C-alpha cells in the first residue's frame, strides 16, 4: 500500500500483517488452503496469475482473456502482465482510500484475506467464445489448479456475485476498468457489517443492495451524473472534459475530514442549484407544474415477516390540492415534491434495487418515515445529505448502521422478525440522536440547510466562469460574477423547458436545464483544483 | 408516441362574435384505436363531441373533444378540467384550464404615413398600433369607412411580449397599403380592434387629412 | 422516422459583422447515432465539424455540421452543396444552397409617435418601418444618440410576406418606448437597420422635434 506505515507493517513476515501470499495461504482463516500444493507444482508453462492486496487475493487464468484476434503467445503474456499490474495497483489504491477513511481503529480489520475468482469461461484461439468449465473439461488450467482447489461456483447467468466470505467474477473481467468497479461493489457487499460500518450491522430493513450501487461504490463511468465517490480508478486520458468526478482518488483523500469537507462543498453547490431551480419552478402555470413535478410516498407493503415496518418508496402523480398549495419554494419541502427529470418512474422503487441518485435532479422532499425504515431513494439522498452536514463517523453511519438499535430497543420500539425479538430504530430517533436537539423534524433540518446555503452564496460567490451552453452560434463568455445572472439563466431555461416536453423517446437529454446545470457543475469543479470551497470570494 | 393531453382556448371570434363558444381538449400521441374517453368536470349543459383519430407526427393517432356553448360557463367563471383514459395505460392524464387574470385594456394608435412616403405619393403605408394588453388573443382588422377590408388586403403581425416593467402587456401593429389619392380625396381609413378584456371588446381609431 | 437533410445560411450578424461565416448543414430523422458523413462540395479552406446530436420530436436523432470561414466563398459566388450519408440507407442524401438572386435595398421610415400619443406626453412610442426588401434576413436595432440600446429595451417584428405587385418584397417593423422629455429636449433617436442587399449593409433613419 502507498502509506509508509502499512508498507512497513506488510513488508515484515509477521502474521495478520504480512502481504505475502504464502503466509496468508498457510495461516488459518483461509477457506481453501488446499491451493498451496497445486499452486506450487504447476507445470512450467504460465497458466494462472494472482493479484494480491492488503485485504484480498485474486485468482485468474490466462485462458480467460485469450480471444479470436487475440491468440496465445508472447502478446497474450504481455497484455496479461500489464493489466494484472494495473489492476493490482487500482485495487491497492481503493483499499488505501478506505484505510485512510476508516479511523475508528476499525482499520485494523482491513488485514483480512478474501479470495476472488474469474469466470472460468476460457476463450479460444479461433473465435471469441468463452466456453464454461465444470471441473471436467480438458483445459490444463482446471486440470492443474482450479480442479484440485475444490470449490464449485454456481455459474450464474450474468452478474458477478458475492458470497459473504469470498467472491467470483461471472460476467465482468478483473483486468478491465469495469472489473475494478464491480470489485468495489463486491467488497462493499462482502465488507459491510464489520469493516465499512463501525462493527454495526445493516439497518434492520435495508437489504444488501442498498449499500452497493447507490453509495459506497465508484461511479460506473466518468460520465455518470450521480452523487458518488470515485474511489478505485484514476484517469486523465482525454477524460478531463465531462469528468464530473474525482480524477485522483489516491491523492484527493487523506483522512475523514477531507472527505467530509469535499462532500459538504459538493452539496454546497448542489443546494444552490436546487434552490435556483425550485425558485424558477414555483412561478409556473398549473399544467407545467403538474407535468414537471411528482410526489414521493412511503408504502408499507407486507414484509416477508410478521411486521410492516419496511417501507418502499413510490412516486405518484400529485393531486390538485397539493399543486395549489405549492405557491412558493418553501412549500416544496413541505409537500415532499420530487422532480420528474431523472425519476420519471410513476410506480414504486422496490427495496433491494439498483437505484442510483441523480446529481442535477432536485429532490426537495425531506420525507422520513415515522416507522423505522426510510426506503431506497430517500434513504440514499438523506444519507448523502447527512454526510454533507456531518462527518462520516457521526452521520451517514448512524443513519444506516443500526448503531442506535440498542438505544432504540432500550427506549422501546420492540419488534420480532424471523422468530427473534430485535430493536427497531426510526428516522425521528436518528434525527434526535445525530442532532441532539438542533432540529425537531426532518423538514426543519432540510429548511435550515437550504437557508444557511442561501446566506452563504448571498455573501460569497466566485468571479469568472465560461459555461455558455447556448445555441450553435459561437458563444463562449458568460463571466457569472453575481448569482443573480445564474438565477436569471436558470429561470429562463426552466421556462423554455416548460415546452418541448411531449417527446416519445427523448424528453430528458434534450432538456436545457440539465445541460445548463451540467455546464455550471463542470465549470465549478474545474475552477477549483480539488473541490475545495465552491462559493468563495464575495457577493 | 407517448400521449399528452392539452387544452386550447376558444377563438376570440367565437368568444366575442360567436354566440356559443367551443372549447377543445385534444389528445395527441394515441398509439392505439379510439378506445378513449373524454371527461369534462364542469357539466354546464354541454356534450363532449368526439371526432375520428387524426395522424399526428410520425402517424400517431390523435383524438379530440369539443365542449360547445362554453361562452356562458366562461361567463359563469367556472374553470375547466379535462380527464381522459386510454387503453395504453391505466393512469388518466389530466389537463386544467382557468381564467387568465389581470387583463389590460388595449390602446389603439393609428399611425399616419411618414412625410417621405407621402412625398412619393405612389402609395401610403397606413399603419396602426395596438398596445397595452395582457392576453395574447387580439383580433385586429382594417376598416375602410363602413366597409370591412378583406384580410388579404392588409397585413398584420402576431402578438409578442413587449419590453415593460412589472405589467406583462403585449403589442400588435398592422400595416395597410392603398393609393395616396384616396387619403387626399377625403375618404378616411379606420383601424378596428377587438379584444376580450374590454367590456365593449372593441376599439376604433380613425383619422384623415 | 424519415431522414431529412437541409442547408441553412449563416446568421446575418455573421454574414455582415462576422469575419468568418458559419454555414449550417443539418440532418434530421436519422434513426441511429452520428455514424454519418457530411461533405461540402465547395470545401475551399474549410473544415466540417459535427457536434452533439440534437433529438427532435418523436425521437428522431438529428446532427448538424458547421462550415466556418464561408464569407469568402459566399463573396466568391460558389454555391454550397452538402451531401450526407447515413447508416440507415446506403443512398446518400444531398442538399444544395445557392445565392439568393434579386436582392432589394430596404427603405427605412422613422415614424414619430402619433399626436394623440404625444398628447399624453407620458411616454412617446417611436416607430421604425423597414419595408421593401426581397430577402427575408434583415437586422434592425434602435440607436440612442451614439449608444445602441439593448435588444431587451425595444421590440421588433420578423420578416413577412407583404402584398405587392410583381416584386416579392418583405416588410418588418420595430417599436420603442421612451418618455417625451428626451424627444422634447432634443435627444434624437436613431433606428439602426442592417441588410445584406445594401452595399453599405446599413441604413439609418433619425428624426426629432
Numbering used by the authors:
A (entry chain P): 1663 to 2201
B (entry chain B), C (entry chain A): 242 to 450
Direct quotes from the study:
Many invasive bacteria block the initial mucosal host response during colonization by cleaving host immunoglobulin A1 (IgA1) via a bacterially encoded IgA1 protease (IgA1P). Here, we used cryo-EM to characterize the metallo-IgA1P of a more distantly related family member from Gemella haemolysans, an emerging opportunistic pathogen implicated in meningitis, endocarditis, and more recently bacteremia in the elderly. Third, all M26 metallo-IgA1Ps comprise the M26 region itself that is responsible for IgA1 cleavage, which corresponds to G. haemolysans IgA1P residues 907-2201. The two histidine residues of the HEXXH motif together with a conserved downstream glutamic acid coordinate a Zn ion to polarize the carbonyl group of the substrate’s scissile peptide.
The catalytically impaired mutant of G. haemolysans IgA1P-E1848A was used to trap the enzyme in complex with the substrate IgA1 to compare its structure to the analogous S. pneumoniae IgA1P-E1605A/IgA1 complex previously determined. Our purification of the G. haemolysans IgA1P-E1848A mutant bound to monomeric IgA1 resulted in a highly pure complex amenable to cryo-EM analysis. A cryo-EM single particle reconstruction yielded a 3.5 Å resolution map that facilitated model building. Only one of the IgA1-FAB fragments is visible, as only one of the two hinge regions within the intact IgA1 is cleaved at a time, as steric hinderance prevents a second IgA1P from binding the other IgA1 hinge. Although most domains within the G. haemolysans IgA1P bound state did not incur large changes relative to the substrate-free structure, the NTD2 does undergo a conformational change. Specifically, the NTD2 repositions 4 Å relative to its free form. Thus, while the substrate-free G. haemolysans IgA1P NTD2 is already 6 Å lower than it is within the substrate-free S. pneumoniae IgA1P, it still must undergo a further opening to facilitate IgA1 substrate binding. Specifically, the conformational changes in NTD2 by the gating mechanism in both metallo-IgA1P complexes results in similar conformations within their bound states that is in contrast to larger differences observed of the NTD2 within their substrate-free states. Arguably, the most important similarity between the two bound metallo-IgA1P complexes is that the bound IgA1 hinge region and the conserved HEMTH along with the downstream glutamic acid motif are in similar positions. Interestingly, both metallo-IgA1Ps have similar stretches of missing density within these loops that comprise G. haemolysans IgA1P residues 1298-1307 and S. pneumoniae IgA1P residues 1054-1063.
